[PDB]
Amino acid sequence: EYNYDENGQFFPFFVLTLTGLVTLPLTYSLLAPRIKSDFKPQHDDIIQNQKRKRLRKERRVKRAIAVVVGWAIIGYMVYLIIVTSYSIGIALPKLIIEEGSGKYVLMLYASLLGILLPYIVGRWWYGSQRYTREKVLAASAGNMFREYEGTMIGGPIVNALSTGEEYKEMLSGPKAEEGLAKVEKKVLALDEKILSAKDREVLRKIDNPVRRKALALLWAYLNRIDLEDPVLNEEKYEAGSIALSLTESFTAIALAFGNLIPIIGAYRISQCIVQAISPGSSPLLQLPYFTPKVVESVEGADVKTHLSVQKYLDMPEERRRSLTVGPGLLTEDQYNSAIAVAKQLPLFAISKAFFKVAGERVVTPSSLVQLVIKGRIIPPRVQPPLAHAPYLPRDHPPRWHIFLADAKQGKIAVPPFTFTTFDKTFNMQTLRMQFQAPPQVGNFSFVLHMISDSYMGFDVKQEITLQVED
Amino acid sequence: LRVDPVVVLVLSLCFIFSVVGLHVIAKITRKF
Amino acid sequence: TYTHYPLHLDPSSKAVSLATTGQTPAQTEAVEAELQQLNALHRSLISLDPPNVPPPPLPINPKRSAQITKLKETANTAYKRGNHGEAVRLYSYAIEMAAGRPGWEPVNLAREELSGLYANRAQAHMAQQMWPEGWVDAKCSVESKPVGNAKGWWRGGKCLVEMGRYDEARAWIEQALGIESDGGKELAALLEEI
Amino acid sequence: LIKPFTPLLPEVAAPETKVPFNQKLMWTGLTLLIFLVMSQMPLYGIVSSDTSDPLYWLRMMLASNRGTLMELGITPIISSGMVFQLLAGTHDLKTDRELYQTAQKLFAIILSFGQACVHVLTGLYGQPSDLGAGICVLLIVQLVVAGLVVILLDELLQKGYGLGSGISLFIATNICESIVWKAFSPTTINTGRGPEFEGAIIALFHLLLTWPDKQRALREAFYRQSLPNIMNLLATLLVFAAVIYLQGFRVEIPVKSARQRGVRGSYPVRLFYTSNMPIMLQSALCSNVFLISQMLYSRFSDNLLVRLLGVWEPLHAASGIAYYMSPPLNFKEALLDPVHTVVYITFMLVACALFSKTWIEVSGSSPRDVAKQLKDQGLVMAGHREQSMYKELKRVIPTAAAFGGACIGALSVASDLLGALGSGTGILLAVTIIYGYFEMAAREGD
Amino acid sequence: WLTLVVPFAYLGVLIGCLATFSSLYRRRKAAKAASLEPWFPPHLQRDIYHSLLHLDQQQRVPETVLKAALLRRAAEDIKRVMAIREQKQALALLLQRGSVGDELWQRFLRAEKEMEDEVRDVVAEANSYAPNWGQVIFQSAREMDANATYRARMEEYQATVAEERAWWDKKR
Amino acid sequence: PRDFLKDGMQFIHKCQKPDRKEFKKVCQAVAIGFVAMGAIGYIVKLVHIPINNILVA
């Protein structure tokens, strides 16, 4: 019961107004600190280029074609405009309802609604299913879950972590067998037995190019091996960044498991991956100008205990003659910078940690009780300085994990509470966390762990006694 | 008897297409 | 369903042997180790009794227990004489006698017996100033039975403090106190020796 | 007694695990698109469409359309529940609940079939003697399968794959379509002098560009008084913003539990207690009165009771009770008859207030009931030595409800009188439902 | 009577298309679900036992070695059962967080059903061999497995005394 | 009479008013939802007017 416009004087106005309302908006819409360091590691160009390549976003091709076609149709419609007792009509061209193009437009609409909708729906469905919560592929998490063992800490964590899925897309094609022999020989030969004992057998046993290459590259990275190939470093410093996210996923999995040793293990492997040190090696390699030689020369010839940063800095002026002697060990101009950058690391030293229920004196069973732990950041919504490790592309904001477990059974008590900010070279701080008290009556014995990633050697382990009565 | 969630959607789509198919078949029969 | 492995039994030996083909050296060595363990189990079962089924683990034969207690008693009364060479020799002999027993029997009995024997041998080595062997024996004993034992933790911590490595001694005594009273008193006294 | 009908009835499968939020939103959007594209498709046996629309005042409340595949899609789903709740109240185990659900669906489908039959036989699509021998049963089976597919989609959306129910979404989408079509409508209506556009913005642009006087062009674009203009759009936007701002009035009462010490909390009581009930039921009552008036005025044309109850004329009720119940057309008709405006004001205000105050007692949110519920849950007043929950609760809730009813009634009246596009009932039913679903979503995944 | 047959034919075509699509989709879903990689590596002791039975059929072999093979298979099976029972709780608790995909839960259920069928089959085969030889099999299996892993751990801890003595003599 | 209005105004003054930021956020969210539904409905109707006019003939 409508009368279309065939002479062309009404549809141009409507289409012009609509496409203008669209294109105007589409065109108008598409028109914290860092720590001080005067040291640059080897292969600076590679790591800096990788850091710059990590982040990238254009957001211009999506709207450019839309805006240009909108302005083109606006120009065409305004050109057609400048060219030129009760009935209702429609501002639409006549050729749409003509007997010639009728079946054509009908079949076009049918094909559109039958193909484009289900195809794009299935695409979005299978595009938002493979990614998990921790930004890792579901295949990777599934493959890593089965590799979980009862009590694995240190070594086997790297083996259970080197079964990821990003390595498939990283070195796909002929990139797997390029320097496999070279990297494998270097890793298996140059490293001593105190850094790998049976991992050599676990590495030799597998028969798969992608996974073996990934594992060898991860070890070569975690040992600061400096292989001579100028093309393999650009993928090693990327395997490290992939291993970091896989470490986050493995921490999530081990936390899902109700065990204690894998938790500390995952935290230590996250501390080691974010840096360049090796799991089990002296944590003294966090300083800028330190090499295996000087750390072997400072902590003794052969020792089973590794001098942490606190006990190293707390020595009297004997390190001056014991470390930077001069014959190939170090230089005073470098040792001064090392000390000046070591005197700025965040170390959390807690002083008081007591339970307290909100609005009551004595903790009642099955009540919501919160603990206040007040320490003081002393170096050996305020943001802390970023990580100091220069051997990874991304910059990691140093976080802190606070949890507590019991000793009568090797199991965790409450889930951890991760945070990254303080309330501001030292001043008192405060940190809170709330959970549910046990249902029954009887004092318990807990120990909280101040395990923190982004650094190795900053751990506080204190025992707290809980009180409960009625 | 239970049915999968995609089956009701494919049934809705097949019904929507069957309606227009019947319409166009009747139009073809009338035109000739 | 299953994968057919070409086997070949050897008469008069009653021990099956794999014939050469799963077209893989890893599979070959795996099935070879499995076959060796199977032959060992077959020897144990043929040495069990005229029947072949293993008896249930509810009853326990007392001959092994009597023998191991007699050996432990004579080793202890020989060590009390003053010498230690023959003492640790008898300790190792009793350890071998205990470990050489089948596994279908209850594990708690063998576990506790090995705990006691390892503790005694660790104390004997402590009497011989041999620190590494004593420490590793104490570690074995405490790994066997952690709860209900304190002398093991104490000997381990003392061996550590005698040989150094103060951090490992701290961690050892810390875990001991976390597990945990004469044991608690000895642990506190050893921790105060830092 | 309804056991054998259990295995025959089709039913959607239960979800394996808890579905995420994005997939649920996708399911909801796809079901809504399917419902809309099905409601915008015509039937086949349509031969005569020039006839007065029966139950025309029910399309807005039932979210249906005349002469399309969705003529009676919504009625069986609501009717089955509305009768089954009553038969259950007049007069358990899962083995009985399964039978109950099967009987509900069977009643729904048989009522769908019966309504399709009474729709095709009454003469809506023409005299059955002239339509065809098989065309009638063809239309029957087509409308029956449409009702079946729509109720199956509703059951799927309700079983857990959807974020809420389908009735509210279906009522809101039609209102939102009618309110956004009124703005950029391409239909032109030539009543002489030259055709103009029905859409508001399109009409403004066209009149501004083609007429020789910009002053007269703007004076025409504003205050059209016959077709939707920009002033009505601005009034609708203002009413929308006012309702959105007014919905966020909540009286937080301090409460702390007594089963586990220390835990605090709050129990809000919104100014819009029983958000969209006093408007929906009042509009349904008015629609039923109007329908009865029309049906009794068509047959009994000449009588005293029909003359006093309601008289219609080109329809539009005039000089009758239904004329008083009908809202004023615009501001001009409002200023012409002041007594009609005043009686409409007072009727709608008192009706909304009384309806809210009597629905709060039946919905189960009475102070005597919710106080006992909170006491059984363990919550106790957190006031300073003021341990009296029922007193404060009975002093707060009833007045709050009896004031919110009148407030939302006055809002609807102001929206319908200022000139807002579409009936104010539709605007409120859209805004309240969208706000409820927004808060439900924001309380779920982000 | 085309008026009587046209709507019936239309509805028949519709229901037939619905039914054939339902059958095709069910078949495709079943074929896709029954084509998942197995959870645990291929069983070896059961393969050795079946090969021993095949060698016995295609032939002389005694019967005690068969009992030893079955005992070893039962030990492996009970270790597998312990592992799956340990992993069940962690997987169930982790599935809700969404950090794990969906196919893993299906693989886990399939592995659980396979283990149930396998334990039923092995207890039946055991009851076939000896009079009332069902539960003593699993008791012996768990005891043997625990004792073997304990002995392995003990030997591993004992195999470090040489390095310890070397280190102490070096530091001395 | 007037007691009802007085009690209502007292309840209103007893309530707490929302701020500007939360109001702006909720208004933006509801407007996004409304505009989405409206655009979908408008496009469906605009694409089904000519298709229907061709189909029914």
Q: Which amino acid is at E64?
A: T
Q: B13 CB near a chain A CB, below 8 Å?
A: yes
Packing angle, helices D338-362 and D277-299, rounded to 10:
120
D177, F48 contact by CB (below 8 A): no
Q: Which amino acid is at A469?
A: E
Residues of chain F neighbouring B24 (CB-CB closer than 8 A): 55
Separation of alpha carbons D286 and D296, rounded Å: 15
CA angle C135, C137, C143 (to 5 degrees): 100
Q: D349 CB near a chain B CB, below 8 Å?
A: no
A21, D205 contact by CB (below 8 A): no
Q: Which one-letter DSSP state was computed for residue A422?
A: B
- Span C62-192 CATH architecture: Alpha Horseshoe (1.25)
Does residue A434 sit in helix, strand or coil? strand
Between strands C7-10 and C15-18, the pairing is antiparallel
Burial of D205 (C-beta count, 10 Å sphere; 0-12/13-18/19+)? buried
Closest by CA position to E139, among listed C103, A387, D398 = C103
Closest by CA position to A284, among listed A257, A326, A259, A312 = A312
Separation of alpha carbons A171 and E133, rounded Å: 54
Record: contact E154-C104, CB cut-off 8 A: no
C131, E168 contact by CB (below 8 A): yes
Containing D189, the helix (H) or strand (E) segment is strand D187-190
Neighbours of chain D (3+ CB pairs under 8 A): A, B, E, F
Distance of CA D74 to the CA centre of its chain: 12
E 127-146 residues inside an 8 A Cβ radius of C = 130, 133, 136, 139-140, 143-144, 146
Separation of alpha carbons A215 and A155, rounded Å: 12
Closest by CA position to C152, among listed C108, C118, C111 = C118
Separation of alpha carbons D134 and E5, rounded Å: 8
Cβ neighbours of D174 (radius 10 Å): 27
Q: How far is CA A286 from CA A270, A271, D416, E156, in A?
A: 14, 11, 73, 34
Technique used? cryo-EM
Residues of chain B neighbouring A106 (CB-CB closer than 8 A): 20, 24
E7-41 per-residue burial string, b: 16 or more CB within 10 A, e: under 16: beebbeebeeebeeeeeeeeeeeeeeeeeeeebee
* Close Cβ partners of D393 (under 8 Å, ≥ 6 residues apart): D253, D367, D370, D371
Separation of alpha carbons E127 and E132, rounded Å: 6
Resolution in A: 3.9
Q: What is the 3-state secondary structure (H, E, C) of E80-129?
A: HHHHHHHHHHHHHHHHCCCCCCCHHHHHHHHHHHHHHHHHHHHHHHHHHH
Does residue D10 sit in helix, strand or coil? coil
Q: Which amino acid is at A426?
A: F
Separation of alpha carbons D62 and D72, rounded Å: 9
Closest by CA position to E164, among listed C135, A192, C89, C127 = C135
Residues of chain F neighbouring A92 (CB-CB closer than 8 A): 49-50
Residues of chain D neighbouring E99 (CB-CB closer than 8 A): none
Separation of alpha carbons E15 and D438, rounded Å: 39
Q: What is the 3-state secondary structure (H, E, C) of A354-405?
A: EEEECCCCCCCCCCEEEEEEEEEECCCCECCCCCCCCCCCCCCCCCEEEEEE
Probe site for chain A from B6, B10, B24, B31 (most A CB atoms < 10 A): B24
D72, D119 contact by CB (below 8 A): yes
Length of chain D counted residue by residue:
446
Å between B1 CA and nearest CA of chain A: 26
Cβ neighbours of A104 (radius 10 Å): 11
Whether D and C touch (3+ CB pairs < 8 Å), yes or no: no
A144, A163 contact by CB (below 8 A): yes
* Close Cβ partners of A171 (under 8 Å, ≥ 6 residues apart): A210, A213, A214, A235
Closest by CA position to D237, among listed F34, F21, A25 = F34
A389-427 per-residue burial string, b: 16 or more CB within 10 A, e: under 16: bbbbbeebebebbbbbbbbeeeebbbebeeeeebeeeee
Record: contact F23-D40, CB cut-off 8 A: no
Closest by CA position to C160, among listed C127, C126, C131, C193 = C131
- Alpha helices, H only, D63-165: 75-90, 94-121, 128-131, 135-156
Separation of alpha carbons E85 and E112, rounded Å: 9
D65, D71 contact by CB (below 8 A): yes
